[PDB]
Amino acid sequence: EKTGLHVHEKIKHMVKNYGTMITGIPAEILGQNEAEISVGYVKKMGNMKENIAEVVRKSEMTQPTNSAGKASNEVCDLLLGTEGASEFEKSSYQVLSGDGSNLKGSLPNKNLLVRVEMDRFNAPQKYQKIKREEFNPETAEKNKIYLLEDQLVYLDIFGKVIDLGQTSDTCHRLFNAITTPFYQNYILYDEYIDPEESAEEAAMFEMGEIVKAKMKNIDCWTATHSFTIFVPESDSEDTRTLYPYQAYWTSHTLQQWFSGDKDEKLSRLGIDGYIEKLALLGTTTDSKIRSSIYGELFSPPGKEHVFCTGMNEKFSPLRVKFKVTEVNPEIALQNLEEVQEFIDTNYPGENAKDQCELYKIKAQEAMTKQLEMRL
Amino acid sequence: HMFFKDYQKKNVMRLLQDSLEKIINEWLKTDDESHTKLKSLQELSEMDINATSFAEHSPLPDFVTRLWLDPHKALDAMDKNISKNEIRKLIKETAREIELVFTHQK
């Protein structure tokens, strides 16, 4: 089959079967590199053979990366070729609209690849009330609110002092109201605050409201997750589908994504249902909703309901940036076949499991050799 | 062919870059009052690709100088289609990225 859908089926099957070997990195340089970053772990007395062997046994070197950006780069290279991927990666992102319509309109019925950068809003969470004569932006804690005698300012992550537009009377009322010594250097957003408690708690709440309102027009966005979405054209009567592809930093690999079938499970939502969830991630003002959607779309398979709870509840606003480019199935299928031929030539076996084991054996022998040499 | 060659090469060089970042990031945690390490990293980031003299008695991590001097001796399984000069440019680019991040520029 020469369709985009067959491209999807093939890349999924190959990553499922071969994991890290889809990078085309030969086993020997993988093992030598692993030795070079593992020499310090080798116990330095005893007999060398089994110390080296022990570090080689606990090496994770054939386990695939869990970098989201690296997985996205791998998908882009395979489906577009290296030059096309580089051009796509340098191209501009667009911010997903509230209803996701600009992405929808960017998905004509051709074979398309979407790349997504998720951003979180890295707003200040702390303030200090301080006399102006003691406020030094060169040494004060950055990404923080500062309340002076008659001024309210934001020291941003770059160390720039940004005025928050409040009047002298507003700021002085705030400064004078916040007298408790423990609240001179404190958190901005207190779940349990209440202004009917006292003028002080009134002022702390009001300052939080002012800062939150002003922050909406300040660029605190910072990138936080990366993934891709393959949207083959519909070449049969079946409804068109999309397939998200990801790794998640420190959490799971692309191979685990496919082997848990999460690409397919999410494809069941349909193009519109998936985009609706993605857009709601950027519009919702409820942290339980934000958390639940984030887990549904982005957790390792099976962790959807525990990914974003407790410490990991998604309290900050998120936004979705996207870019789209056309996939040529002739190119992608040729690229994937070349990876397959490399694997079959250099790591032969009767099935993929045996080929993976041969790759691991060759890497471990290379690592043993390199470690013995350096020691 | 043509795709696989370039794709493999770029992924191997990314692997080496990851190793460079791990080793240099750890090494930078223990600089001195004169910023000896940082300064040597900054010098490396703009280094003449034909230079070797600096590596004779350098504060740089041993893996970095070994990879710079003779990458195909440091890792003798490295494909010969990865040139010494490609490795040296990779080392320079990595040093530049790390240096700007470390000095809170980026």
Residue numbers in the entry:
A (entry chain A): 7 to 381
B (entry chain B): 9 to 114
Q: What did the authors write?
A:
Recently, two L. pneumophila effectors MavC and MvcA, were identified as structural homologs of cycle inhibiting factor (Cif) effectors.
The complex structure revealed that MavC and Lpg2149 bind as a 1:1 dimer, consistent with the molecular weight of the complex measured by gel filtration coupled with static light scattering (SLS) analyses. Lpg2149 has an overlapped binding site with Ub in MavC, but does not interfere with UBE2N binding, indicating that Lpg2149 inhibits the activity of MavC through competing with Ub to bind MavC. Lpg2149 extensively interacts with MavC via multiple contact points, burying a surface area of 2229 Å2. Contact A3, involving the N-terminal long α1 helix (residues 11–38) of Lpg2149, contains six pairs of hydrogen bonds: the sidechain nitrogen of Lpg2149Q16 with the main-chain carbonyl oxygen of MavCG30, the amide nitrogen of Lpg2149F12 with the sidechain of MavCE344, the sidechain hydroxyl of Lpg2149S27 with the sidechain of MavCN39, the sidechain hydroxyl of Lpg2149Y15 with the main-chain carbonyl oxygen of MavCI28, and the sidechain of Lpg2149N19 with the main-chain carbonyl oxygen of MavCT29. In contact B3 which involves the α3/α4 helix region (residues 70–77/79–82) of Lpg2149, the sidechain of MavCQ38 forms two hydrogen bonds with the sidechain oxygen of Lpg2149D84 and the amide nitrogen of Lpg2149A85. Superimposition of the MavC molecules in the MavC/Lpg2149 and MavC/UBE2N–Ub complexes also shows a rotation of around 6° of the helical-bundle tail region, where both Lpg2149 and Ub bind, indicating a binding-induced movement of the helical-bundle tail region.
